[PDB]
Design a protein around this nucleic acid. Sequence first.
DNA 1: ATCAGAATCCCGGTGCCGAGGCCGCTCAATTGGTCGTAGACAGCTCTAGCACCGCTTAAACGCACGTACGCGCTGTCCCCCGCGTTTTAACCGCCAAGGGGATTACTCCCTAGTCTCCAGGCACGTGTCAGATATATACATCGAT
DNA 2: ATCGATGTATATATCTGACACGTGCCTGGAGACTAGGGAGTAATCCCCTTGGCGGTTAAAACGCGGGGGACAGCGCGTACGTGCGTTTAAGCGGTGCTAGAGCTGTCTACGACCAATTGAGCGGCCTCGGCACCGGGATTCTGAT
Lengths: 92, 95, 104, 106, 83, 82, 96, 96
Amino acid sequence: KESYASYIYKVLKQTHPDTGISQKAMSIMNSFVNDIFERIASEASKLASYNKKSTISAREIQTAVRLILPGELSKHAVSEGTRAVTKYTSST
Amino acid sequence: RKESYASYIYKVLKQTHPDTGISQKAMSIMNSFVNDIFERIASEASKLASYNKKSTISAREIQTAVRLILPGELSKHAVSEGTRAVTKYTSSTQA
Amino acid sequence: TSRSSKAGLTFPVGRVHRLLRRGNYAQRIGSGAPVYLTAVLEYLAAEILELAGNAARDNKKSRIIPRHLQLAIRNDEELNKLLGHVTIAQGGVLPNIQSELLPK
Amino acid sequence: ASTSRSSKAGLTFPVGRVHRLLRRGNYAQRIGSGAPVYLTAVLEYLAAEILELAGNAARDNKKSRIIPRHLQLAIRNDEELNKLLGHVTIAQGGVLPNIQSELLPK
Amino acid sequence: KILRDNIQGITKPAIRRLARRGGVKRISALIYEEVRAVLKTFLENVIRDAVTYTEHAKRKTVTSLDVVYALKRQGRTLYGFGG
Amino acid sequence: ILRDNIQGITKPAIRRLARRGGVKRISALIYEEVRAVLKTFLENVIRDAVTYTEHAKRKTVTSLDVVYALKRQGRTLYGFGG
Amino acid sequence: HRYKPGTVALREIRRFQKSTELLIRKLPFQRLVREIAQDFKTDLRFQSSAIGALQESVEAYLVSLFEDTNLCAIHAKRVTIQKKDILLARRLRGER
Amino acid sequence: HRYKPGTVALREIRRFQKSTELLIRKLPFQRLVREIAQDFKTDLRFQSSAIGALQESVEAYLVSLFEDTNLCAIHAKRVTIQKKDILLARRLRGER
DNA sequence: ATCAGAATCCCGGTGCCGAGGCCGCTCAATTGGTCGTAGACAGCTCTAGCACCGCTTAAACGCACGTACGCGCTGTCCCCCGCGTTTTAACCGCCAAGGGGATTACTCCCTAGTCTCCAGGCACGTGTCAGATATATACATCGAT
DNA sequence: ATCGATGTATATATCTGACACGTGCCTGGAGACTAGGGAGTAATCCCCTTGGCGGTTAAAACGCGGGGGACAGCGCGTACGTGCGTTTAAGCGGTGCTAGAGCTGTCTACGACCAATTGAGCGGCCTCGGCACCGGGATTCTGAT
């Protein structure tokens, strides 16, 4: 049974390398990550369906992020996403 | 060619009310309502099939989605109408 | 010969089956699912149009306009619950004045 | 053997697992190459933000272990995440300590 | 056994504590019946959705995932029990 | 370029809106709050509609974009397509 | 002669509850919509039906808001609606 | 040494707003859940975590409802909450 | 109760424009055959949900009593309604232009599908330390004077 | 002002169970090759969006008088909060057992796919009748008497 739990622990130690996290908080974080993933994926799928497209690419994910996330969070998530995509494209 | 339910909504209206007419804006409203209900039921059935690790949408999933979405009287009547249609269809399609 | 006539329905069984195949809902789709879905849609459409026709008859009209659909939906508790968050264009509102504002 | 796609993108969350979830989730017939990377980066940013606010809340309470109460404080105290998670209930989260002014003595 | 009268099990002090967490300072005596009725309605809705999910899953035990999906269906998303 | 168009929603229009809502008597300070509520709701709907338009690489806002944005906001509009 | 200060308001209430037309003039609403859209993207164009859908949604939302404001005013043993009534109506509906 | 009728109530408000524990005794809630579920399907079984999730959701919903009731009681220049306040709060939330 | 005037309802006439019907066409549903696979069913395991008993003790409950607050009444004054007069700009129609949205055709590169391999992540196991509990205690706040 | 009660915060010590680390494995992710079709781009056309002119009239703005409704103050009585003794059942811990969740194996019915056919449904054109607008009499309803 896969979960985000180990990755959340790594991010937490990367941010604050002296605090632990309870199991209930781990379950809450995993559920929050799954919920956000589901919302973004469903929005991107509907968006690609409206425009008669048959593929999910970076642009639809960017537009879905701009749709769900509030303005400051949307701007920062878009900036980080475009940074990661540029890094991956340069590295390939 | 742009598809819609408008030409079927008229047949049902003439069946239930032989003499009443209906404007174009009501066609748009009824088409939107039918599309909305269709998309709601289909999405709910898709999620239902995804929860049970299945890959087929059958009458079972659609019936359970109908029970979930519609209020109690509408759910019971829609289930009765759907099961009657399905039993009539399987009665005929091989016999 | 058509699947709607075989099931005794007026709604298109084949078109609903194509829409279910193209909507990206599941990898496979059973044979009776489109029949069930068209039966449910036909019943709901019949209920809404019957109520709209009755509302139009009460208004002494022979044409169904958005006002009649709006009245029919808000005057039926179950459909109002089903369509609570839905707004109908050119539908207006239910005639309802609070008793506290009525005069002496 | 070769490097994980998260290391190529420079992220901690698994890009390949998100790609598998996108393929198996019945969202579209095709999935672009950069879509899982973008989604992974967004998820990592959101997780990092929540954990930063939860860690700050835990340090304020002089605690060294993040518990659901600190998640509730972090989410309900920030306006953006409260808009994002306004319809979300957190188990064992409690409520914000807010008292109406008229109920106070005098 | 068949159950009959367990709605009174939500005692008056329980309602008073729930109101104290919500910030209510002073409570009038007819509130309790209304709160019990609201509880009955909400639990009936959620239990109907969960039992429908369970009956679809061919199971006889209401799994916590069923309740989580039932809550999500009505928009009352709950974190901490999966999904 | 445009200036102060929230006054274009005149006081009699708000009065007529309140009359449909069943309001019999209106305080003088209601109008500014109603204009602010209008400006925020229209800002949200226009933001989502322009986002949907920008995705399709279009320069015109179609009725379908507005209908989709409203459906996303949780208030569904019937009779305008979709 | 003059009607009493209740009566004309009630007549208007009945008249506008019986009808289905749009209450806001179309050109002012159009200009407001274009001004608001000016802040997100320049040189935008609007289909007429899009502006009509926007106007219909605004009419429904404002009408529902005024209904809720009337109920929360009647709760306070008042006829007249104040700014605080609208604030309460929006706070309880989860808009603030 | 009787306290004035405000001050103990405020102490309880601070105590339960700093706390997190479940406020409803578990066994009566389980029995109520069983009684309610008995109607839809006989001889059912419940996982413990399912009942825990049900109780968490109920407590959160009732806390939100009581906050809204308190707000609409404050609107009427009162402190005591009456049944009409709960009715108005549910009517504005958009519940039946 | 009355009566006059303003508003609404109803009844009939005329018009007009949008709904209903008919016809050509085209492309989307149907049918028939083949093939892979998925889910229905049987069977085995072993987990956990239910039922019970016993002891404890903390929460609920019933009642007495006091007092703070809801509610009804009264006076006041202010500010919103309703109507007459002036102004202005919304709307309809008509024309002109141009630009961009939808369509079609061509191309090429990007992703599904399959294979082969291997390393990371996840149950199982473990140990140790932060926090829960308990206890003592200090401190600030409510209350009565 | 002030001190006593009192709950609440604070500091320390034992434990404990829950969290942080190690290990082995196995299955899901990465590299490589293939085809093919979906998406990017370029040209076209026409329709449908924007802009301007004019009038004219209905709607918005403005002034003003006044009345009725919001609001503040006051009295009262009763309903709810607080405290205390009693009792009741919730909680915890152990033990039982059996129903049923969960996993695996098998196989056959059933649904994806593909090519040919053709007839149902959609776009366009035309017309006439339902409804709307106008107008005028009838009825209702409101407010002052």
